[PDB]
Amino acid sequence: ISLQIPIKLKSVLVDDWEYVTKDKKICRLPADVTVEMVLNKYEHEVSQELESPGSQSQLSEYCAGLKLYFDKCLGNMLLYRLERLQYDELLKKSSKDQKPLVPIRIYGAIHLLRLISVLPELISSTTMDLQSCQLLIKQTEDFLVWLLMHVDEYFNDKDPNRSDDALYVNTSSQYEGVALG
Amino acid sequence: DKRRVAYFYDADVGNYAYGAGHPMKPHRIRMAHSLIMNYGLYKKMEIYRAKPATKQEMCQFHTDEYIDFLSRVTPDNLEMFKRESVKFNVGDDCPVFDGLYEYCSISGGGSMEGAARLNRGKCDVAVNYAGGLHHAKKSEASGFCYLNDIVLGIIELLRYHPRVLYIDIDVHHGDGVEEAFYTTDRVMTCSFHKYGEFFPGTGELRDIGVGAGKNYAVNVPLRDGIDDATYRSVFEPVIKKIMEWYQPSAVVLQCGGDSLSGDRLGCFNLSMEGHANCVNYVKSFGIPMMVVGGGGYTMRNVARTWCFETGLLNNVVLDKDLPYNEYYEYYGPDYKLSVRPSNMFNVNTPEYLDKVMTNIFANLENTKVEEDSAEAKDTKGGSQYARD
Amino acid sequence: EEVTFFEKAKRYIGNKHLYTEFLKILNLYSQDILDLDDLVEKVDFYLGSNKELFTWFKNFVGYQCEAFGPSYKRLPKSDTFMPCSGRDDMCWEVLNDEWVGHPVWASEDSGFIAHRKNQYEETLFKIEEERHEYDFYIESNLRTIQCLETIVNKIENMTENEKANFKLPPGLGHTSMTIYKKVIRKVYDKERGFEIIDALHEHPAVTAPVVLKRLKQKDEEWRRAQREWNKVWRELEQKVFFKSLDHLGLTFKQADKKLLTTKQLISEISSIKVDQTNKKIHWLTPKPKSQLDFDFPDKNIFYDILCLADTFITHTTAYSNPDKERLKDLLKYFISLFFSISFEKIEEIFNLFANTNIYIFFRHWTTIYERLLEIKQMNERVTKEINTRSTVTFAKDLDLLSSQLSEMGLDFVGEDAYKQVLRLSRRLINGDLEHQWFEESLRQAYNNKAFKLYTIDKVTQSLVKHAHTLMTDAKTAEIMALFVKDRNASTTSAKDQIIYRLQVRSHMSNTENMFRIEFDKRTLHVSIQYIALDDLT
Amino acid sequence: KKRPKRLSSQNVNYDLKRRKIITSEGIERSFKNENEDFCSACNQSGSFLCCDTCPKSFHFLCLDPPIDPNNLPKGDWHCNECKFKIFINNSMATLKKIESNFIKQNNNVKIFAKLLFNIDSHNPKQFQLPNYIKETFPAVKTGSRGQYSDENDKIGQSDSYNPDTHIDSNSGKFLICYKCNQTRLGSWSHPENSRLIMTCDYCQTPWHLDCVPRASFKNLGSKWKCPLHSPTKVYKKINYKVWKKQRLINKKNQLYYEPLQKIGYQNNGNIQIIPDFKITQIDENSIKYDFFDKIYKSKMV
């Protein structure tokens, strides 16, 4: 069981780690792009790019499975201790609104990239069929090259110290005191 | 020349000792006042006592949750106080002591009472030694200061004055005031401290503010054991340049014994004369001046130099003789008003200071219940028996 | 000069990796990534010294935003949303909610450390903590005594009908809330404190006199114990405060041997020589012949060092008698010959080529001269300072003065300070001065400033041992003999020092070092030149 | 002559302590009658909670339900796999084939349903980088608590004379500063003439404390980076380009070299000097050539 990730994408994960732990930057919750939009753009783009030999069925099946996996795996493998209270304030600000909060509508694709990175660990820790595993690997690589060709307009490198929208916000002093205290 | 100076003393400022084996101590104010009346300075100086502040009168800079926390500080139930302690940094590095609420209330009362007395025009120099806390943040207790009374004093001065300059001359400079006035153009913050493996670790040469507060916050780093002559060289030209260029209407003086020769976490090597002649030079301009005190790890030395600062502000020269007071056992073997400088190495080079001068000049050449608002209410305080 | 600019830059940079970093910065501006200000501040640290090259670059390029420092980065607008009803519009426009600082960001998740202090400063700090805590206890207690005597004075002239019902709010009618609660928590039990303050709040004038009596006897015994603490506390403070004032002098007992060696002296002189030669190579091909110059403004200092020497002749026991006589004789002769001192009241240009032993001995003597110059220059201030010490009579009445050193006569009052220091150095040479006593006297007498003479016996012993090698070594005896032959007090310069240099290069070997000591009779000026390995090349 | 024996008093002992005078002398007759302390969810420390039958500790934030201490639930607290081991699906209705009928129930998400099932049988934890991401970037190493630590981060003495800082043990020569061509060791007779110097943590370049704006040494925090190397963050206003370098990669097959063109290559930096992340071999001639082309084409603009 081996999975490959392109080196630009691995650079995205390692500078995510740098911004979280060293540079003290957490993800911007009201981002203009949510993971549902990413998966919908994926599905329509790869449906309109190729022909229709029957791949749409398991395409939408993988899309829905990844949607509910990202719903049920947001805070169980992902989400460093710094953003746990971010998730907590999302849940209480939704509980005061009498609305069940889903991570799909508000979270960014960088956490999906984190889930893709730890996918080999979850796959090797479960008993699964061989053909389903190779199909999941093929769909993962297809999503990775789709992220490759749309790499410019999706992960825009911006400094949040001088811009309003940079898909990242900075840690405050009380944030540090309640997070790492 | 001759100027009326208001001294603000509270009988309960020292009644709240923070803890045992403890650097920060508000206890020095009581021997400061004892030396005030023991020197016979009350005949040419008026004394009033400031009232304690309320909940809403501390709300102009700090958050409501900070005020609620500082209202409900009790060390007895600290077991369950864990979300709010760390959020504002309390109990991890800065422990909890009883009677804090009255301490910060009288601190803010003295600070904005001095600001209001400066704004009204009753006195030329306002002295509030009971509160000089400068390290407190908007939602963080750091630098062992919980309420940054200097920020509310500055904005109360801005309620009447157009421009007011804040200065700090001791080590562990107050980053809270610089953070609070980082974007405004009508407020300028000056800092005289040291950098490099130090506790605050903030204040750079490139740190001059952003936005409308660009080039409106100067910060010069220093080194260990800077002597009196080099401190005069780093004080006087930048002071005359900042009076010529910025032209403030009021000056906030944060005197303290942290910049003296003897200190616990400090690194400076100035005596009483070096700490006082700079104040004399900045007072010779004749501009209204606010004096606050919130530093000093030693106790005898900071009490002695603050007594000398009051004596200088009274336009008299204090003798070296020390009379009898209830605090006479504190001082050293000589038992005189003499803060002896240490023999620290003067690593601070003249060329480094000169390069700092060129960078500072190049940065500064571009400058060219609320019912009780506005204060104006203090007790008379005409009968003290601190003389011995 | 474009075709020779990169060669000059490569020659100036020297190191290869630094040239690759320069090449990378060159690309960073050349790839439309860096701006002109970044290149300007890069060449500010790169070619700042070369003014001609910097002006050439500025003219060729054509050079005529926010700073955004490492600290105080921008917060999100989510934290700005905060009701804050006690904030008006002027507070809105003078204060910012999107900029906050925190020292752990400056530490880069590594923490902070404090300045290291010696043990005397630490015990002074701890006794200051004891004094603060104990006096705070006493004075908060008698403030509570004042509060209790005030409300007892209020209830002194009223009847039992209003004495039974005297319910009062917290604070006891004063402007403080918890000073009385804190002092009764300190003096009574933790669990009993709640019940006694409840009884005091809900029922005064019945429990107030008894707690008044208990607190008053607590103040009485507290003041008595403070009074009996005061004598020993002041005695410890008198001996620990001047130790705490001294910082470099505490480690000077080892610093005066660590920094004052041979190899450190060759290291210093070679650093000065290489700095001057590199600066001239950068600037101008001729080099100056004057560096590390010592001025001699006084003549009695040599007499004081001679007094220390002839006091130290009769103290050492590991040397034979005529060896001591010979070393004293040539030590006197060195002063009698070097500075043209024909006669002394205490006895009862020229070029010199020297090896490393005589060089470090001369550097030792110039260091001693510098120490005596620094204590002499400010001697005339401390003399009149100690002449009119206005003693406070109130401390005399309670016996508060520092009389630790006045019994046997170490006080500097009523006598010259420099003569007393000379006598103390002579007695320390005699070895019966209980060294800490001399250290404390020198600290108190001139305010801890002259730390350089704390090891006077040690440096005198080292200089005596180095001067003993002047005659034992055959080469040193030879060069002293030809220095006797060369010195004639006649106009023979500019044609005789070449043969001198040739013969001292021939007689000594390659591993020995050469030092040019140029002495001027007028105004007493000296020049020491490092000329090692320049003639045998 | 300190005497702590007889003048030690009776009411008060040595301070920063207490004694029996506050308990025995308090007469007032006026009232007239398995767990761990490592917290294996983020490898850090803080406020801990523990389960009775589980030896793993968690913080109040490192849980699937985020809980505050001010409103913590009463009674016993149990983890997710505690609910999966001693509770339902393993005590009663034990996990025989519930994965397959779960797949049948949840509308055939079987390519992800096994991971959905394994979500419940797993404790919540912080994100940790996978092992195969560590090998491709050798510059970053795991810290003590699990933070990002690249090569920017580092692993009488206290004042006074320090000539050992001016002397390098590699050759014994003199550390000449870049700006002023001096080491300025000074002398023991004039300590004030001496200037503090420091070496670089990357290229060992000597530097004075007076040339660059810097007060004292850098002992705690990130490595002292002299302003001579490639900066990690650049800024150009046009909104802007930040260009956070590439933080280097391994020597293995991921590193690709392709020296083809020297003029107008559009490599946007990230080059090395010789005598995907596509990097090219770059010499001095190419660099000066593209510079001269660039500032000649940019003078008139």
JSON list of C-alpha atoms in Angstrom, two decimals, chain B residues 92-210:
[
{"chain": "B", "resi": 92, "resn": "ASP", "atom": "CA", "xyz": [0.32, 30.72, 34.93]},
{"chain": "B", "resi": 93, "resn": "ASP", "atom": "CA", "xyz": [3.06, 33.36, 35.01]},
{"chain": "B", "resi": 94, "resn": "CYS", "atom": "CA", "xyz": [1.21, 36.05, 37.01]},
{"chain": "B", "resi": 95, "resn": "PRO", "atom": "CA", "xyz": [-0.44, 34.60, 40.15]},
{"chain": "B", "resi": 96, "resn": "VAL", "atom": "CA", "xyz": [-3.63, 35.75, 41.86]},
{"chain": "B", "resi": 97, "resn": "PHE", "atom": "CA", "xyz": [-3.54, 37.94, 44.97]},
{"chain": "B", "resi": 98, "resn": "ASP", "atom": "CA", "xyz": [-6.36, 39.19, 47.18]},
{"chain": "B", "resi": 99, "resn": "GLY", "atom": "CA", "xyz": [-7.60, 42.76, 46.89]},
{"chain": "B", "resi": 100, "resn": "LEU", "atom": "CA", "xyz": [-6.73, 43.27, 43.21]},
{"chain": "B", "resi": 101, "resn": "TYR", "atom": "CA", "xyz": [-9.98, 45.01, 42.22]},
{"chain": "B", "resi": 102, "resn": "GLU", "atom": "CA", "xyz": [-9.40, 47.99, 44.51]},
{"chain": "B", "resi": 103, "resn": "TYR", "atom": "CA", "xyz": [-5.77, 48.17, 43.35]},
{"chain": "B", "resi": 104, "resn": "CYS", "atom": "CA", "xyz": [-6.63, 48.51, 39.66]},
{"chain": "B", "resi": 105, "resn": "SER", "atom": "CA", "xyz": [-9.57, 50.80, 40.48]},
{"chain": "B", "resi": 106, "resn": "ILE", "atom": "CA", "xyz": [-7.40, 53.28, 42.40]},
{"chain": "B", "resi": 107, "resn": "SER", "atom": "CA", "xyz": [-4.69, 52.91, 39.73]},
{"chain": "B", "resi": 108, "resn": "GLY", "atom": "CA", "xyz": [-7.09, 53.97, 36.98]},
{"chain": "B", "resi": 109, "resn": "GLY", "atom": "CA", "xyz": [-8.58, 56.64, 39.24]},
{"chain": "B", "resi": 110, "resn": "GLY", "atom": "CA", "xyz": [-5.17, 58.19, 39.80]},
{"chain": "B", "resi": 111, "resn": "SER", "atom": "CA", "xyz": [-4.23, 57.94, 36.13]},
{"chain": "B", "resi": 112, "resn": "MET", "atom": "CA", "xyz": [-7.31, 59.61, 34.67]},
{"chain": "B", "resi": 113, "resn": "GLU", "atom": "CA", "xyz": [-7.45, 62.02, 37.62]},
{"chain": "B", "resi": 114, "resn": "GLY", "atom": "CA", "xyz": [-3.97, 63.19, 36.64]},
{"chain": "B", "resi": 115, "resn": "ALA", "atom": "CA", "xyz": [-5.08, 63.35, 33.02]},
{"chain": "B", "resi": 116, "resn": "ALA", "atom": "CA", "xyz": [-8.17, 65.41, 33.93]},
{"chain": "B", "resi": 117, "resn": "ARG", "atom": "CA", "xyz": [-6.14, 67.74, 36.17]},
{"chain": "B", "resi": 118, "resn": "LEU", "atom": "CA", "xyz": [-3.71, 68.24, 33.29]},
{"chain": "B", "resi": 119, "resn": "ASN", "atom": "CA", "xyz": [-6.57, 68.90, 30.86]},
{"chain": "B", "resi": 120, "resn": "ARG", "atom": "CA", "xyz": [-8.42, 71.36, 33.12]},
{"chain": "B", "resi": 121, "resn": "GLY", "atom": "CA", "xyz": [-5.32, 73.42, 33.94]},
{"chain": "B", "resi": 122, "resn": "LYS", "atom": "CA", "xyz": [-5.33, 73.32, 37.75]},
{"chain": "B", "resi": 123, "resn": "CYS", "atom": "CA", "xyz": [-1.75, 72.00, 37.82]},
{"chain": "B", "resi": 124, "resn": "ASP", "atom": "CA", "xyz": [1.17, 72.05, 35.39]},
{"chain": "B", "resi": 125, "resn": "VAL", "atom": "CA", "xyz": [2.62, 68.64, 36.34]},
{"chain": "B", "resi": 126, "resn": "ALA", "atom": "CA", "xyz": [0.49, 65.66, 37.40]},
{"chain": "B", "resi": 127, "resn": "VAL", "atom": "CA", "xyz": [2.20, 62.94, 39.46]},
{"chain": "B", "resi": 128, "resn": "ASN", "atom": "CA", "xyz": [0.46, 59.60, 40.01]},
{"chain": "B", "resi": 129, "resn": "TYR", "atom": "CA", "xyz": [2.99, 57.15, 41.45]},
{"chain": "B", "resi": 130, "resn": "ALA", "atom": "CA", "xyz": [0.21, 54.85, 42.71]},
{"chain": "B", "resi": 131, "resn": "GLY", "atom": "CA", "xyz": [-0.36, 53.62, 39.16]},
{"chain": "B", "resi": 132, "resn": "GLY", "atom": "CA", "xyz": [2.15, 53.36, 36.33]},
{"chain": "B", "resi": 133, "resn": "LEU", "atom": "CA", "xyz": [1.24, 50.05, 34.73]},
{"chain": "B", "resi": 134, "resn": "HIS", "atom": "CA", "xyz": [2.17, 49.96, 31.04]},
{"chain": "B", "resi": 135, "resn": "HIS", "atom": "CA", "xyz": [2.52, 46.28, 30.03]},
{"chain": "B", "resi": 136, "resn": "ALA", "atom": "CA", "xyz": [-1.17, 45.31, 30.08]},
{"chain": "B", "resi": 137, "resn": "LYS", "atom": "CA", "xyz": [-2.84, 44.41, 26.78]},
{"chain": "B", "resi": 138, "resn": "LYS", "atom": "CA", "xyz": [-6.43, 44.61, 25.57]},
{"chain": "B", "resi": 139, "resn": "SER", "atom": "CA", "xyz": [-7.19, 40.98, 26.48]},
{"chain": "B", "resi": 140, "resn": "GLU", "atom": "CA", "xyz": [-3.91, 39.75, 27.95]},
{"chain": "B", "resi": 141, "resn": "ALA", "atom": "CA", "xyz": [-2.10, 40.18, 31.27]},
{"chain": "B", "resi": 142, "resn": "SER", "atom": "CA", "xyz": [1.62, 40.23, 30.45]},
{"chain": "B", "resi": 143, "resn": "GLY", "atom": "CA", "xyz": [4.56, 42.13, 31.86]},
{"chain": "B", "resi": 144, "resn": "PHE", "atom": "CA", "xyz": [2.97, 41.63, 35.30]},
{"chain": "B", "resi": 145, "resn": "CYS", "atom": "CA", "xyz": [0.54, 44.51, 34.64]},
{"chain": "B", "resi": 146, "resn": "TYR", "atom": "CA", "xyz": [-3.21, 43.87, 34.60]},
{"chain": "B", "resi": 147, "resn": "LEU", "atom": "CA", "xyz": [-4.77, 47.27, 33.84]},
{"chain": "B", "resi": 148, "resn": "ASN", "atom": "CA", "xyz": [-2.92, 49.58, 31.45]},
{"chain": "B", "resi": 149, "resn": "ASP", "atom": "CA", "xyz": [-3.97, 52.84, 33.09]},
{"chain": "B", "resi": 150, "resn": "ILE", "atom": "CA", "xyz": [-1.61, 54.80, 30.82]},
{"chain": "B", "resi": 151, "resn": "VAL", "atom": "CA", "xyz": [-3.88, 54.16, 27.80]},
{"chain": "B", "resi": 152, "resn": "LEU", "atom": "CA", "xyz": [-6.93, 55.66, 29.52]},
{"chain": "B", "resi": 153, "resn": "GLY", "atom": "CA", "xyz": [-4.77, 58.51, 30.79]},
{"chain": "B", "resi": 154, "resn": "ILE", "atom": "CA", "xyz": [-3.59, 59.22, 27.24]},
{"chain": "B", "resi": 155, "resn": "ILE", "atom": "CA", "xyz": [-7.09, 59.17, 25.77]},
{"chain": "B", "resi": 156, "resn": "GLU", "atom": "CA", "xyz": [-8.39, 61.36, 28.62]},
{"chain": "B", "resi": 157, "resn": "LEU", "atom": "CA", "xyz": [-5.61, 63.80, 27.71]},
{"chain": "B", "resi": 158, "resn": "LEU", "atom": "CA", "xyz": [-6.68, 63.52, 24.05]},
{"chain": "B", "resi": 159, "resn": "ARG", "atom": "CA", "xyz": [-10.22, 64.46, 25.12]},
{"chain": "B", "resi": 160, "resn": "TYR", "atom": "CA", "xyz": [-8.84, 68.01, 25.53]},
{"chain": "B", "resi": 161, "resn": "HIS", "atom": "CA", "xyz": [-5.27, 68.06, 24.11]},
{"chain": "B", "resi": 162, "resn": "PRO", "atom": "CA", "xyz": [-4.71, 67.52, 20.37]},
{"chain": "B", "resi": 163, "resn": "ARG", "atom": "CA", "xyz": [-1.41, 65.61, 20.66]},
{"chain": "B", "resi": 164, "resn": "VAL", "atom": "CA", "xyz": [0.15, 63.84, 23.66]},
{"chain": "B", "resi": 165, "resn": "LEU", "atom": "CA", "xyz": [3.47, 61.97, 23.71]},
{"chain": "B", "resi": 166, "resn": "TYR", "atom": "CA", "xyz": [3.96, 58.83, 25.81]},
{"chain": "B", "resi": 167, "resn": "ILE", "atom": "CA", "xyz": [7.48, 57.95, 26.95]},
{"chain": "B", "resi": 168, "resn": "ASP", "atom": "CA", "xyz": [9.04, 55.10, 28.93]},
{"chain": "B", "resi": 169, "resn": "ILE", "atom": "CA", "xyz": [12.56, 55.19, 30.37]},
{"chain": "B", "resi": 170, "resn": "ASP", "atom": "CA", "xyz": [12.93, 51.89, 32.27]},
{"chain": "B", "resi": 171, "resn": "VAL", "atom": "CA", "xyz": [13.66, 48.34, 31.12]},
{"chain": "B", "resi": 172, "resn": "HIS", "atom": "CA", "xyz": [10.75, 45.99, 30.31]},
{"chain": "B", "resi": 173, "resn": "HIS", "atom": "CA", "xyz": [9.05, 48.67, 28.23]},
{"chain": "B", "resi": 174, "resn": "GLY", "atom": "CA", "xyz": [5.28, 48.74, 27.95]},
{"chain": "B", "resi": 175, "resn": "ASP", "atom": "CA", "xyz": [4.25, 47.11, 24.69]},
{"chain": "B", "resi": 176, "resn": "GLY", "atom": "CA", "xyz": [0.56, 47.55, 25.53]},
{"chain": "B", "resi": 177, "resn": "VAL", "atom": "CA", "xyz": [0.56, 51.31, 24.91]},
{"chain": "B", "resi": 178, "resn": "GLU", "atom": "CA", "xyz": [2.46, 50.92, 21.63]},
{"chain": "B", "resi": 179, "resn": "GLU", "atom": "CA", "xyz": [0.00, 48.21, 20.57]},
{"chain": "B", "resi": 180, "resn": "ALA", "atom": "CA", "xyz": [-2.95, 50.43, 21.53]},
{"chain": "B", "resi": 181, "resn": "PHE", "atom": "CA", "xyz": [-1.68, 53.50, 19.67]},
{"chain": "B", "resi": 182, "resn": "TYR", "atom": "CA", "xyz": [-0.16, 51.72, 16.67]},
{"chain": "B", "resi": 183, "resn": "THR", "atom": "CA", "xyz": [-2.49, 53.12, 13.99]},
{"chain": "B", "resi": 184, "resn": "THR", "atom": "CA", "xyz": [-3.32, 56.64, 15.23]},
{"chain": "B", "resi": 185, "resn": "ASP", "atom": "CA", "xyz": [-1.37, 59.65, 13.97]},
{"chain": "B", "resi": 186, "resn": "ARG", "atom": "CA", "xyz": [-2.10, 62.08, 16.83]},
{"chain": "B", "resi": 187, "resn": "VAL", "atom": "CA", "xyz": [-0.52, 59.79, 19.46]},
{"chain": "B", "resi": 188, "resn": "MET", "atom": "CA", "xyz": [3.23, 59.13, 19.51]},
{"chain": "B", "resi": 189, "resn": "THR", "atom": "CA", "xyz": [4.95, 56.52, 21.69]},
{"chain": "B", "resi": 190, "resn": "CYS", "atom": "CA", "xyz": [8.64, 56.63, 22.62]},
{"chain": "B", "resi": 191, "resn": "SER", "atom": "CA", "xyz": [10.51, 53.82, 24.38]},
{"chain": "B", "resi": 192, "resn": "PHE", "atom": "CA", "xyz": [13.90, 53.76, 26.14]},
{"chain": "B", "resi": 193, "resn": "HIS", "atom": "CA", "xyz": [14.66, 50.09, 26.81]},
{"chain": "B", "resi": 194, "resn": "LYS", "atom": "CA", "xyz": [16.88, 47.17, 25.83]},
{"chain": "B", "resi": 195, "resn": "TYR", "atom": "CA", "xyz": [16.41, 44.25, 23.43]},
{"chain": "B", "resi": 196, "resn": "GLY", "atom": "CA", "xyz": [17.94, 40.82, 22.99]},
{"chain": "B", "resi": 197, "resn": "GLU", "atom": "CA", "xyz": [17.12, 37.82, 25.21]},
{"chain": "B", "resi": 198, "resn": "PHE", "atom": "CA", "xyz": [14.89, 40.09, 27.30]},
{"chain": "B", "resi": 199, "resn": "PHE", "atom": "CA", "xyz": [11.47, 39.43, 28.79]},
{"chain": "B", "resi": 200, "resn": "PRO", "atom": "CA", "xyz": [9.19, 41.52, 26.46]},
{"chain": "B", "resi": 201, "resn": "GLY", "atom": "CA", "xyz": [11.36, 41.06, 23.37]},
{"chain": "B", "resi": 202, "resn": "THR", "atom": "CA", "xyz": [9.46, 43.71, 21.39]},
{"chain": "B", "resi": 203, "resn": "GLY", "atom": "CA", "xyz": [10.40, 47.06, 19.90]},
{"chain": "B", "resi": 204, "resn": "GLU", "atom": "CA", "xyz": [12.50, 47.18, 16.73]},
{"chain": "B", "resi": 205, "resn": "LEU", "atom": "CA", "xyz": [14.20, 49.79, 14.58]},
{"chain": "B", "resi": 206, "resn": "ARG", "atom": "CA", "xyz": [11.75, 49.02, 11.76]},
{"chain": "B", "resi": 207, "resn": "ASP", "atom": "CA", "xyz": [8.87, 49.10, 14.29]},
{"chain": "B", "resi": 208, "resn": "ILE", "atom": "CA", "xyz": [7.48, 52.58, 13.62]},
{"chain": "B", "resi": 209, "resn": "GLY", "atom": "CA", "xyz": [3.81, 51.72, 13.11]},
{"chain": "B", "resi": 210, "resn": "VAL", "atom": "CA", "xyz": [1.58, 51.06, 10.11]}
]
